[PDB]
């Protein structure tokens, strides 16, 4: 049980609330003529717009602070976190995380992924670049409150075990960081493969009940589980490159994107193998589920380069799990 939705050019990131029912997703829009960008808010089962907001800076990660029901958006090309009331649909405020200068030689770091913590209204933020960051944000007035410095070379991954106050970022030098929230600081930095390849860690999602972390990389065609205790492998899962990644405590799976591929792959978490594949044409990107972890939804983008730009909009696929 699949539905295809048309929703708007540059679709990335999405967040849920039940209590709204509702789902929201980041676009940037058009590149080439749109400054500024969209978040759309959608009915969980025919995926209509039901909200449009037009936002002054694109907007492209999001997550949701349940307990206080806002959306935060990572402004990747602003160096900016925005944050949105997810009851109106009102734009709260913005902060800017990295105010320098784009020049050739100066690139200021800018955010990928985002992670609310709804126990203390915190949210973390990975910055991206030769030499990463991890800013940490105050979400009760959108003020920094300090930045986890030294994440290394392009430490995109972000997840967050709140009752165990534990972040965790994966980054491009093949390291698995993990963080202390009580005093924001790096208690460990594990290389999680040692074959002389290189691996590039992109996204994790854990089981926080178990103890695990699911992993993706970019350079290899598996995906890695790995006990969050001590940085043990528990499992290599065989899969294309893998760039998005879910874990679902209702089904004990993981899903995870295929981009160049098309498709989303269903990982059984208690065999360690791929049981499903899902047709997700033509380029899967991000991926939500709803609160009862009974639904999936990816967002698709169509093929395009700054070249030849997509004249169709993206969509967002509902499956039934």
């Known amino acids: 049980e699949m539905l ?15 209590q709204e029912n509702a789902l929201w997703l980041a676009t940037s829009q058009s590149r080439k003529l749109d400054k500024g960008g969209v978040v759309y808010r959608l009915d969980p089962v025919t995926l209509e717009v039901t909200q449009a907001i037009h936002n002054d800076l694109k907007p492209f990660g999001a997550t949701i602070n349940n307990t206080t029901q806002t959306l935060w958006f990572g402004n990747t090309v602003n160096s900016a976190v925005t944050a949105i009331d997810a009851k109106t649909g009102e734009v709260k ?17 800018q955010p990928r992924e985002l992670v609310a913590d709804d126990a203390t209204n915190t949210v973390y933020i990975s910055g991206i670049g030769k030499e990463s960051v991890i800013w940490v944000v105050d979400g009760g007035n959108i003020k920094l ?37 009580a ?13 002389g390849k290189e691996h590039f860690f992109i996204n994790i999602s854990l ?28 499992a290599k899962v065989a899969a294309p490159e893998s ?64 070249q030849q730009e997509a ?3 993206d969509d967002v696929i509902r499956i039934a799990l």
């Not at 902060?95 to 050739?104: A, M, N, P, S």
């Not at 300090?146 to 980054?171: F, H, P, V």
């Open 183 to 195: 005093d924001n600081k790096i208690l460990s930095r594990k290389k999680l493969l040692d074959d």
């Open 93 to 109: 405020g913005r902060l800017v995380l990295d105010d320098r200068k784009r020049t050739e030689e100066v690139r200021p770091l």
């Open 145 to 181: 409150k300090t930045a986890i410095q030294n994440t290394g070379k392009m430490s995109t991954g972000l997840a967050l075990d709140s009752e165990g106050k534990r972040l965790y970022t994966t980054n491009a030098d093949g390291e698995l960081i993990t963080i202390d929230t």
């Open 243 to 306: 760039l998005a990644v879910l874990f679902n405590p209702a089904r004990n799976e993981a899903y995870v994107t295929h981009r160049q591929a098309g498709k989303v792959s269903v990982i059984d978490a208690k065999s360690y193998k791929v049981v499903k594949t899902f047709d997700t044409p033509t380029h899967p990107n991000s991926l939500a589920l709803s609160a009862d972890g009974k639904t999936l939804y990816v967002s698709v983008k169509q093929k395009s380069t700054k």
């Open 207 to 234: 089981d926080t009940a178990r103890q695990r972390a699911f992993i993706t990389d970019s350079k290899a065609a598996e995906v890695l589980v790995v006990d969050t205790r001590n940085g043990n492998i528990l």
């Open 311 to 313: 004249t169709q909009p």
């Open 4 to 18: 295809r939705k048309a929703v708007g050019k540059g679709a990335y990131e999405m967040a849920y609330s039940q």
